[PDB]
């Protein structure tokens, strides 16, 4: 359902990582499968060649937390005008305090050890439910 | 250029904001509205260092990149006990527990 | 317009009304003072910073910085977040 259109009409883009995270760009291919691409260190940028009507999204390369691109989840390259690339400005979202706390707990405690933490079972399940590109795609449907 | 502050006296903490170009006197007027004490019965500090009424917040080292929403800077506050000013006292927050073995 | 948020250990945090309504649990408790019997000051001060952070950077075109959490407060802060629904 969610997938790139095979246009064969080129589009130059600037992937600009304006976040503290190492970023993993993910292209949704012609069957809607997520293909991962080379990472971008925090504060860096790359000029890259894509095509019109291609679907892209962006994640933390280590933990897979979701990130925004021009204030939204999906980015679609469009027609260039006056030799000017399109900017894909990648940023952190305003995470909920709860979700942000979960990220920090995950980074310190191994999945084996989540059950040993002194918390309600509601939070065990929340911890275990890792961020995932496949899950996010099924929501959009 | 906004700045974000914790104005602190005893066990009171006021979360508020201002500009780098704001004066210290404007911080006292904010305190007056909340705690009902006039500017001349207040005394504001950056650590030990007293802040005069005419000084802007930028001059005294409160900048938009240091005094942030998620990590606001502290301004000390001391009231005048009718005759004379009390010593600056700010109660510390509670202590977090020891990290478990699994962290 | 301000509201007083009070920790278990007696600290009185004064924050703007609109910032405190970020938490739905607080929205319910009010609709001027609120007392939290289970949240100590080193946790509750962080909650108050999160409110400020959310109101500044929500629907913002600028770069957004990380909201930091020291490892020593994470477990306690998580449980406050879950209770407060923020
Ligand atoms: C006929 C067609 O459209 N083929 C696809 C496979 C294609 O050429 N694509 C899919 C995406 O629209 C991008 C484009 C490719 S594979 N461009 C080359 C490219 C290589 C590396 C990058 C990246 S991503 C982060 N760093 C780099 C260097 C970006 C684009």
Residue numbers in the entry:
A (entry chain C): 62 to 202
B (entry chain A): 1 to 103
C (entry chain B): 17 to 47, 58 to 112
What does the paper behind this entry write?
Hydroxyproline is the key recognition element of small molecules targeting the von Hippel-Lindau (VHL) E3 ligase, which are of interest as probes of hypoxia signaling and ligands for PROTAC conjugation. The modified Hyp residue is crucial also for the recognition of the hypoxia inducible factor 1 alpha subunit (HIF-1α), the natural substrate of VHL. The new structures revealed that the noncovalent interaction network between the compounds and VHL residues was fully conserved and consistent with those observed with previous inhibitors.
To introduce the O-to-S substitution at the right-hand side, the Hyp hydroxyl group of intermediate 5 was first protected with TBSCl, followed by thioamide conversion to give intermediate 6 (68%). In contrast, ligand 2 (single right-hand side thioamide) showed a greater loss in binding affinity (10-fold loss by FP, and 20-fold loss by ITC). An increase in hydrogen bond distances was observed for compounds 2 and 4 (3.0 ± 0.1 and 2.95 ± 0.05 Å for O–H⋯SC groups, respectively) compared to 1 and 3 (2.52 ± 0.05 Å for O–H⋯OC groups, on both compounds). We therefore evaluated the interaction energy of each protein amino acid in the complexes with its surrounding to determine differences in relative EMM-GBSA compared to reference inhibitor 1. The results, shown in Table 1, indicate that the loss in binding affinity observed in compounds 2 and 4 is largely contributed by destabilization of Tyr98 and, to a much lesser extent, of Tyr112, especially in compound 4.
